[PDB]
Ligand binder design. Structure first.
Ligand SMILES: CCC(CC)[C@H](NC(C)=O)[C@@H]1[C@H](O)[C@@H](C(=O)O)C[C@H]1NC(=N)N
Length: 349
């Protein structure tokens, strides 16, 4: 299908299994960081990748284990990378569940050497959630990259969802954002969006809004936008243009990038309505506008699942360079795709 700069496998089954990928680009470093769950949900691993423009290809180093990203007697999962341009610090957020009552933990480990080494995990659970904790059974972050805003305080936005016990029934899940306006010092919990929303990610648009796209039991993605930097999500509706597979849907990813014409959205997710196959790439020139969403362009044929996008700057063709990470061939491996806006949306460049 679609010709791309590079298509390679960064993780593969054998010794252990790997799922739930997360991608992070380090602008002033030309580098990328591929995160994932190393399953015997056990530990989180990481692979550093140095991108070279001339050879149109990224060079991946050895695989490593974020030793710090874990709590004793707790499995880890849902790695959510995020980079603070302001301080140049790195944040890897995750979840720790022990080996009806909530026992989930929110944790973060930071790096100041571009992810070469990490700190001690900070358990943000009690200060970040508060009394509402007991009101849930479980929650989670990402999985995937998080967001930093363009507001005064260059706030940090972490996408998440909680499994609300609102009743005589199961628990209902709703997405929300963990906000910090002091570079991961303090954390607050923004409000929820429509019910029955799950794994999600956010991106900033053009005055300034936060578009949040979430997984859903239904047959179409659920999309909500915010005007108060993620605190609230006024609008919120089904985007029939973005199919969602049968079971309980599947995780997608979305990022923003500068329009060649103020940003546009790129989104990745399986295109098959009846399964997790044929990973497409949808483009939105008039974000957030739900009907502005284009048809998808086939990125990879066959079985596909969780994915994560990353804007990588300028491609060798002059167009926006993108970095994709997705689960393939029935979780047998994880692939790193790299292409440009040109190759994907030739009519749009
Ligand atoms: C129970 C809530 C689910 C998310 C909608 C569930 N996530 C967690 C943290 O348990 C995911 C889901 O069951 C699996 C999938 O859809 O592929 C992956 C699975 N995620 C992980 N094993 N990390």
């Amino acid at each position: 299908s679609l010709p791309v700069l590079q298509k390679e496998s960064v993780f593969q089954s054998g010794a252990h299994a790997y799922r739930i990928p997360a991608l992070l680009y380090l602008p002033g470093q030309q580098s990328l960081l591929a995160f994932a769950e190393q399953r015997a949900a056990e530990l989180i691993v990481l692979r550093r990748g140095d991108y070279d423009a001339p050879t149109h290809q990224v060079q991946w180093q050895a695989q490593e284990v974020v030793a710090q990203a874990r709590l004793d007697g707790h499995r880890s999962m849902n790695p959510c990378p995020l980079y603070d341009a302001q301080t140049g610090t790195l944040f890897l957020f995750f979840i720790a569940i022990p080996g009806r009552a909530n026992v989930t933990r929110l944790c973060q480990v930071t790096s100041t050497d571009h992810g070469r080494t990490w700190s001690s995990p900070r358990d943000l659970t009690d200060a970040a959630i508060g009394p509402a904790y007991r009101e849930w059974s479980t929650f989670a972050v990402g999985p995937g990259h998080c967001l930093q805003l363009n507001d005064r305080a260059r706030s940090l936005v972490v996408p998440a969802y909680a499994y609300r016990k609102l009743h005589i029934q199961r628990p209902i899940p709703s997405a929300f954002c963990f906000l910090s306006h002091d570079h991961g010092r303090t954390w607050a919990r923004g409000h929820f969006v429509a019910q029955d929303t799950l794994e999600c990610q956010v991106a900033e648009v053009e005055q300034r809004v936060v578009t949040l796209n979430a997984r859903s039991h239904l047959r179409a993605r659920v999309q909500a936008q915010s005007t108060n930097d993620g605190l609230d999500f006024q609008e919120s509706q089904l985007v029939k243009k973005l199919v969602e597979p049968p079971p309980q849907g599947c995780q997608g990813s979305v990022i923003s990038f500068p329009s060649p014409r103020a940003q546009w959205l790129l989104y990745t997710h399986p295109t098959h309505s009846w399964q997790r196959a044929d990973l497409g790439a949808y483009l939105n020139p008039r974000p957030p506008a739900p009907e502005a969403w284009s048809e998808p362009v086939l990125l990879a044929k066959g079985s596909c699942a969780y994915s994560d996008l990353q804007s990588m700057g300028t491609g060798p063709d002059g167009s926006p360079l993108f970095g994709c990470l997705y689960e393939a061939n029935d979780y047998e491996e994880i692939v790193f795709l790299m292409f440009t806006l040109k190759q994907a949306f030739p009519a749009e460049y």
